[PDB]
Amino acid sequence: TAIFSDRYKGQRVLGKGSFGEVILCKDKITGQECAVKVISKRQVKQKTDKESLLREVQLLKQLDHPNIMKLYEFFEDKGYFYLVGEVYTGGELFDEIISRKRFSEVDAARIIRQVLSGITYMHKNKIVHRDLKPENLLLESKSKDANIRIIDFGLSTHFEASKKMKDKIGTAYYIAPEVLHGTYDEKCDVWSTGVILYILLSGCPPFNGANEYDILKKVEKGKYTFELPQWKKVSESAKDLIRKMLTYVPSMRISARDALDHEWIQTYTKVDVPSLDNAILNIRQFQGTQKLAQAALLYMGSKLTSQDETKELTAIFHKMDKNGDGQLDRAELIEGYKELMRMKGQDASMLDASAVEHEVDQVLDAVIEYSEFVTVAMDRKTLLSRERLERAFRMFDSDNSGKISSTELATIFGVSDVDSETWKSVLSEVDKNNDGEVDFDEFQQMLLKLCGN
Numbered sequence: 001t002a003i004f005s006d007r008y009k010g011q012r013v014l015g016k017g018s019f020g021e022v023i024l025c026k027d028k029i030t031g032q033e034c035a036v037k038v039i040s041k042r043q044v045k046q047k048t049d050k051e052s053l054l055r056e057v058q059l060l061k062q063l064d065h066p067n068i069m070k071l072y073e074f075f076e077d078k079g080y081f082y083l084v085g086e087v088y089t090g091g092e093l094f095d096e097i098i099s100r101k102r103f104s105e106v107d108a109a110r111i112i113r114q115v116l117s118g119i120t121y122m123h124k125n126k127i128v129h130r131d132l133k134p135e136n137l138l139l140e141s142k143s144k145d146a147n148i149r150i151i152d153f154g155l156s157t158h159f160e161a162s163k164k165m166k167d168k169i170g171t172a173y174y175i176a177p178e179v180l181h182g183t184y185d186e187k188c189d190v191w192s193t194g195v196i197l198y199i200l201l202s203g204c205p206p207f208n209g210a211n212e213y214d215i216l217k218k219v220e221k222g223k224y225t226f227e228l229p230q231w232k233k234v235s236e237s238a239k240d241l242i243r244k245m246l247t248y249v250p251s252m253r254i255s256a257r258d259a260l261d262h263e264w265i266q267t268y269t270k271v272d273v274p275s276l277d278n279a280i281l282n283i284r285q286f287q288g289t290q291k292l293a294q295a296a297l298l299y300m301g302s303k304l305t306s307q308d309e310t311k312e313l314t315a316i317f318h319k320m321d322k323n324g325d326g327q328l329d330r331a332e333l334i335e336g337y338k339e340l341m342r343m344k345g346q347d348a349s350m351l352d353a354s355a356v357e358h359e360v361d362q363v364l365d366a367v368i369e370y371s372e373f374v375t376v377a378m379d380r381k382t383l384l385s386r387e388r389l390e391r392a393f394r395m396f397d398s399d400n401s402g403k404i405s406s407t408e409l410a411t412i413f414g415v416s417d418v419d420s421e422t423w424k425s426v427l428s429e430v431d432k433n434n435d436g437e438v439d440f441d442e443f444q445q446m447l448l449k450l451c452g453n
């Protein structure tokens with residue numbers, strides 16, 4: 001009954017999350033800022049009925065814990081769901097960890113106590129996460145003492161997971177084996193936390209592989225070891241907790257509540273404690289790899305979307321061109337730009353007609369010839385993905401060599417799920433005399449060829 005766009009105005013894009021885009025919105029009356037997740041009904045299938053989702057939303061809005069994202073409102077229209085809640089500005093936990101100079105078991109214990117405290121509270125209220133991963137751990141604010149906030153508790157119960165690799169990066173490392181076979185309960189979140197803890201103390205995923213399916217095979221077998229040099233400096237109580245959290249049979253696995261009472265959490269959140277330097281280095285490399293694979297898939301996705309929309313907007317304006325002089329008025333360009341989103345679905349950044357008019361005004365200030373309007377309007381859509389790709393390449397290239405080796409390409413394309421023979425074939429066409437490494441432009445050329453260009 002209540003309309004989302006009548007209450008809130010979209011201010012900035014916050015980024016892509018599970019099931020949808022996240023937008024920084026502001027209440028038009030009170031000035032309250034909020035983070036809004038927009039879920040497209042045509043792209044995301046519902047697992048439950050309308051009344052089951054309404055009942056969970058009503059419960060989720062009443063729950064309150066300092067390590068759980070606060071939900072404020074919920075809206076639904078013909079084609080979307082709008083989940084409105086509190087905005088957190090500290091970024092992803094792992095992006096803050098790689099910025100600091102030192103990281104010890106005290107820092108890892110304080111992180112995991114917060115995550116376990118939030119999970120314990122949500123399990124007492126019969127809510128399961130299922131998709132707990134570092135990307136769902138946000139820091140409340142930019143301060144070094146900020147609490148961790150878990151986002152997306154309870155959503156996996158009501159929305160089906162995306163099958164596209166651009167939406168599944170990192171997910172295979174943390175998923176509990178019982179989730180893969182279909183019988184699972186709240187203990188799956190203890191397993192996921194166990195994996196995160198293993199990565200915080202060693203910087204290496206316990207279940208790894210050269211591609212998504214190889215990771216899932218290791219997860220399904222459930223076997224892992226503490227046979228890496230970096231585990232020698234870690235306490236025995238930490239390894240005991242990980243062992244209890246990564247116990248295969250969920251009825252034998254420790255509960256979130258009992259993981260809080262574990263000796264490791266009690267000792268390290270209240271006796272020599274060195275900095276886990278090799279772990280930080282490995283987390284920094286792991287984070288850079290995941291972000292570059294993700295940036296590569298989103299670059300290819302936005303390039304295909306841009307090609308689709310460039311051609312559709314050209315056809316719309318060509319039909320609207322009454323005399324065929326290649327030119328149109330501002331009012332006509334709004335009509336055609338609105339027509340594009342009416343058929344291709346509403347864009348998260350274009351919440352209502354007023355947002356569409358402002359986007360058209362920004363393009364008209366740079367450039368009337370409708371072909372020029374199309375080019376500038378579509379380059380603005382890809383801007384973020386192109387600069388994210390170059391920035392992620394530069395971050396991955398930690399020695400500033402300007403190049404990425406074939407072994408690094410194999411790792412990146414493995415995480416991106418691009419077949420080995422497919423990317424090597426593309427590399428041969430970009431540079432016929434390739435010498436086992438590519439610069440940024442050659443890498444970008446490879447991605448353009450990997451999406452039909």
Ligand SMILES: Nc1ncnc2c1c(Oc1cccc(Cl)c1)nn2CC1CCNCC1
Pocket residue numbers: 014015016017022035036037069083084085086087088089092135136138151152
């Ligand atoms: N609370 C937040 N504050 C700031 N940004 C948020 C979020 C967030 O979690 C949401 C935001 C709105 C609704 C729901 Cl159900 C979850 N998702 N995002 C988007 C981020 C999530 C982490 N990677 C970058 C994009």
Ligand SMILES: [Ca+2]
Pocket residue numbers: 396397398399400401402403404
């Ligand atoms: Ca390099």
